[PDB]
Amino acid sequence: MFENITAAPADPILGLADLFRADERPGKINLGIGVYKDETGKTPVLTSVKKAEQYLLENETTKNYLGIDGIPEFGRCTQELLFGKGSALINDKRARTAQTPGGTGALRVAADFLAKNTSVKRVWVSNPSWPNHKSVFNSAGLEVREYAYYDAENHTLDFDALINSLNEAQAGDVVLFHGCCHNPTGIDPTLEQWQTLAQLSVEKGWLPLFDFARQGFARGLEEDAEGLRAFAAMHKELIVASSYSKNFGLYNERVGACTLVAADSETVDRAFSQMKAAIRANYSNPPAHGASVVATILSNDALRAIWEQELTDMRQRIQRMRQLFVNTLQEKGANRDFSFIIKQNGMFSFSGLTKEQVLRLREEFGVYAVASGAVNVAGMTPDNMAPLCEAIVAVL
Amino acid sequence: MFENITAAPADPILGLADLFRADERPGKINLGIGVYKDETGKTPVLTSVKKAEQYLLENETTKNYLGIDGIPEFGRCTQELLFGKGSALINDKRARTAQTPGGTGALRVAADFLAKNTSVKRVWVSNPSWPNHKSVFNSAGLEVREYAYYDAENHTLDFDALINSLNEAQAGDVVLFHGCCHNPTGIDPTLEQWQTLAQLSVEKGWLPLFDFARQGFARGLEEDAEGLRAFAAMHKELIVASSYSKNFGLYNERVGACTLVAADSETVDRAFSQMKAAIRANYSNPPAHGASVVATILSNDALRAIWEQELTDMRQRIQRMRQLFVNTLQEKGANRDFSFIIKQNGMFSFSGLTKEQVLRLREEFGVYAVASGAVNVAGMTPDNMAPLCEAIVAVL
Numbered sequence: 001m002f003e004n005i006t007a008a009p010a011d012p013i014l015g016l017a018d019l020f021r022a023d024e025r026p027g028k029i030n031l032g033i034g035v036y037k038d039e040t041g042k043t044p045v046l047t048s049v050k051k052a053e054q055y056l057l058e059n060e061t062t063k064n065y066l067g068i069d070g071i072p073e074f075g076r077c078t079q080e081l082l083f084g085k086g087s088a089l090i091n092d093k094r095a096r097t098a099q100t101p102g103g104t105g106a107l108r109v110a111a112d113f114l115a116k117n118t119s120v121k122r123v124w125v126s127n128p129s130w131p132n133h134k135s136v137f138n139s140a141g142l143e144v145r146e147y148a149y150y151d152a153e154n155h156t157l158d159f160d161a162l163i164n165s166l167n168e169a170q171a172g173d174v175v176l177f178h179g180c181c182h183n184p185t186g187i188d189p190t191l192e193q194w195q196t197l198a199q200l201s202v203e204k205g206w207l208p209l210f211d212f213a214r215q216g217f218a219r220g221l222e223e224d225a226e227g228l229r230a231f232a233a234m235h236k237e238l239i240v241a242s243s244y245s246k247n248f249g250l251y252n253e254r255v256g257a258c259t260l261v262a263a264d265s266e267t268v269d270r271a272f273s274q275m276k277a278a279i280r281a282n283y284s285n286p287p288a289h290g291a292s293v294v295a296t297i298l299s300n301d302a303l304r305a306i307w308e309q310e311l312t313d314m315r316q317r318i319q320r321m322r323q324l325f326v327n328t329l330q331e332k333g334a335n336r337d338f339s340f341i342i343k344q345n346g347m348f349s350f351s352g353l354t355k356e357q358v359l360r361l362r363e364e365f366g367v368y369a370v371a372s373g374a375v376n377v378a379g380m381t382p383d384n385m386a387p388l389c390e391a392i393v394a395v396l
Numbered sequence: 397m398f399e400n401i402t403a404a405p406a407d408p409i410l411g412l413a414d415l416f417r418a419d420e421r422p423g424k425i426n427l428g429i430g431v432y433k434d435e436t437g438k439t440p441v442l443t444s445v446k447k448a449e450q451y452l453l454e455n456e457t458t459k460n461y462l463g464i465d466g467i468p469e470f471g472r473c474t475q476e477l478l479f480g481k482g483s484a485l486i487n488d489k490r491a492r493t494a495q496t497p498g499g500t501g502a503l504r505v506a507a508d509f510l511a512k513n514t515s516v517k518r519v520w521v522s523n524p525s526w527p528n529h530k531s532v533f534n535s536a537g538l539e540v541r542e543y544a545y546y547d548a549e550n551h552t553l554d555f556d557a558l559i560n561s562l563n564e565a566q567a568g569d570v571v572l573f574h575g576c577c578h579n580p581t582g583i584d585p586t587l588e589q590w591q592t593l594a595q596l597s598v599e600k601g602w603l604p605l606f607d608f609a610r611q612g613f614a615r616g617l618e619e620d621a622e623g624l625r626a627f628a629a630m631h632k633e634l635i636v637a638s639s640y641s642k643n644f645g646l647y648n649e650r651v652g653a654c655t656l657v658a659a660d661s662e663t664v665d666r667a668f669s670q671m672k673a674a675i676r677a678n679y680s681n682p683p684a685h686g687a688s689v690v691a692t693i694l695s696n697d698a699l700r701a702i703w704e705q706e707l708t709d710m711r712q713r714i715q716r717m718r719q720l721f722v723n724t725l726q727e728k729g730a731n732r733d734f735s736f737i738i739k740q741n742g743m744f745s746f747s748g749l750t751k752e753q754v755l756r757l758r759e760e761f762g763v764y765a766v767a768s769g770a771v772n773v774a775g776m777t778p779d780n781m782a783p784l785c786e787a788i789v790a791v792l
């Protein structure tokens with residue numbers, strides 16, 4: 001049965017990582033992966049988390065299965081975060097949330113759901129996007145088209161190009177949006193743009209799918225959600241996939257959610273049932289540990305305060321590295337302006353580098369960027385900035 | 397898009413559990429879900445687990461992603477449990493293991509893998525079997541056929557009928573086998589039958605897929621792997637989906653493994669890469685918590701000794717309930733002769749009840765069995781026995 005199986009192509013992200021290890025060179029930097037890093041170059045366990053964990057150690061009396069959708073408080077807490085405390089969506093019992101194994105698991109779950117219960121055939125993602133988007137949708141047997149997004153020339157959002165590709169999209173098509181902190185560009189729309197896209201969407205019959213993997217990393221928890229919120233204000237239906245991997249430092253625990261929104265309660269309920277059937281035939285029910293830690297923290301005022309502060313620290317550290325990066329770029333001879341960087345959000349920055357430049361950076365230099373050409377500002381440290389900056393100049 | 401979605405039917409297992417949850421009548425017995433219960437009628441957290449979770453709490457320094465296949469130690473440990481310390485499959489490096497979200501997760505990954513990289517079109521499952529089997533397979537696009545297994549008349553394994561039905565199975569078809577403790581029948585094959593089953597499988601070209609969800613609940617860790625080991629001794633290829641939900645009481649942490657076995661290390665490696673690609677488009681990487689717990693316990697002689705003892709206690713409590721159940725039934729007045737019970741293994745027992753009897757047994761007195769007429773022996777206590785049997789006799 002397996003003699004003729006072909007090797008699978010290496011994973012664009014994961015693949016690069018494997019090689020980072022094998023590169024046995026001393027002073028090699030590693031800016032190519034969307035995980036948070038501290039001033040010391042480590043990815044620690046949050047203090048709020050370690051606390052929520054003592055608590056769970058002390059208080060759990062059973063490990064009996066959660067329900068297919070997971071921890072209820074988990075669900076309410078997420079919807080609050082997404083939509084806001086006094087949301088009508090919430091008030092009208094118009095949304096349902098399923099706890100899933102990470103942001104990926106949600107996407108997948110949303111994928112299977114749509115493929116088997118709807119007339120959906122195509123999902124539109126941006127160019128560029130997180131490479132894994134395509135594989136997940138394609139796995140559900142859905143088509144993935146692409147929309148223009150980035151302006152290679154001006155290092156900004158190509159609004160017209162974007163609105164222009166979107167016209168090849170049919171009513172009933174799924175359009176995927178990065179909630180904030182676009183991967184891998186770091187370029188997000190403005191509130192005004194989001195509002196324009198929102199009106200367009202309803203005018204056109206698109207089904208919005210938001211990918212929210214870094215809420216709290218652009219401007220702050222609430223700000224970062226104004227986009228989603230503008231859509232939710234006019235859409236009857238919508239889907240949201242979120243992840244708590246970056247914001248809670250819970251990567252390996254697989255904490256995310258899939259929120260389904262319908263015109264009304266009777267509808268989401270009917271629909272949510274199919275979504276649950278989908279989960280049942282996939283992984284059955286979710287992993288408790290990380291979601292539990294999340295609920296505990298979001299529910300306890302003290303823990304939650306420590307957490308938001310930890311989040312703020314992470315976010316500020318990033319903002320520090322962008323400025324420091326363009327600065328050192330300048331003081332290092334670079335004679336290209338890297339100031340657009342400063343206007344970018346999140347961990348990712350589309351530096352401007354070329355496919356070859358990237359190869360070079362890593363071959364000669366030991367500096368590992370993303371295949372796509374983006375760098376993870378979060379892997380930069382006051383210590384590694386110089387060396388890293390010399391190398392980039394050396395290839396411009 | 398959601399307007400006409402049709403509500404999903406209730407799950408045969410999960411659906412009853414909920415039904416049982418919305419009735420607070422007194423002496424309400426719950427025998428229809430396959431979770432272990434103690435004499436107190438609870439599902440406790442093992443002490444070995446509690447011990448391991450502290451260690452983790454004390455040692456963990458990061459929640460950074462695990463690789464697609466999870467924890468290495470976890471894989472080796474699983475393999476040794478499965479095949480034996482000195483297995484050739486192990487020495488020849490002929491097997492690769494992916495850490496998955498529970499046994500359902502493993503099954504689903506095996507399914508996607510098979511569907512996308514192979515000529516498999518059908519999977520043969522026993523009649524009856526755990527109802528979720530048909531669902532995971534169908535979700536992956538595979539078709540499922542059923543082979544006879546159970547002798548309603550004699551409360552045994554219909555070996556002839558089984559073999560006789562399997563004959564309709566072609567070369568390249570997947571035949572699903574429950575490693576031990578058949579669900580929901582409790583009827584397992586003898587070693588001699590396994591051997592017969594192994595040899596016929598080789599010559600007919602079936603691809604064996606073993607579902608191993610309760611290793612340790614029949615006779616013991618090793619003893620339980622006997623059947624798996626006979627096949628392994630003469631197949632070039634095979635797939636193993638295992639669960640640590642029951643045996644470690646880690647139900648909600650989602651701890652399982654998918655083991656792939658090929659003719660050699662090069663083949664296994666190439667197939668495995670296709671497996672990892674399947675995972676990556678599903679949930680991406682697995683939940684660390686449960687698995688670390690397993691790995692830690694399995695690696696430590698001390699924790700290990702403690703863990704095996706707790707398993708032994710669980711197993712012996714079930715054996716106790718089997719005997720007490722036939723005795724009480726006996727006394728309480730039953731007409732039928734339920735000694736066959738004694739010969740069954742694990743948590744379940746096909747009592748031999750009809751569809752109506754189960755309906756009645758639950759509308760009438762609040763005894764909740766599985767639609768199939770199976771009854772979870774592990775949800776029986778010395779307290780609830782009498783009332784239980786009283787209800788049962790009332791319906792024969």
Ligand SMILES: Cc1ncc(COP(=O)(O)O)c(CN[C@@H](CC(=O)O)C(=O)O)c1O
Pocket residue numbers: 013032033034035101102103104105130132178183211213243244245251255256679680
């Ligand atoms: C935009 C985006 N969406 C969804 C996800 C999936 O998140 P979960 O880890 O919660 O599943 C990621 C993670 N992308 C990271 C890491 C990775 O892809 O493995 C990145 O390096 O871009 C992401 O960047």
Ligand SMILES: Cc1ncc(COP(=O)(O)O)c(CN[C@@H](CC(=O)O)C(=O)O)c1O
Pocket residue numbers: 283284409428429430431497498499500501526528574579607609639640641647651652
């Ligand atoms: C035969 C069998 N295989 C796989 C699984 C899945 O195990 P995981 O929980 O590790 O995914 C179960 C669990 N079956 C239980 C519980 C359930 O079906 O949800 C049962 O009631 O039979 C099972 O009985």
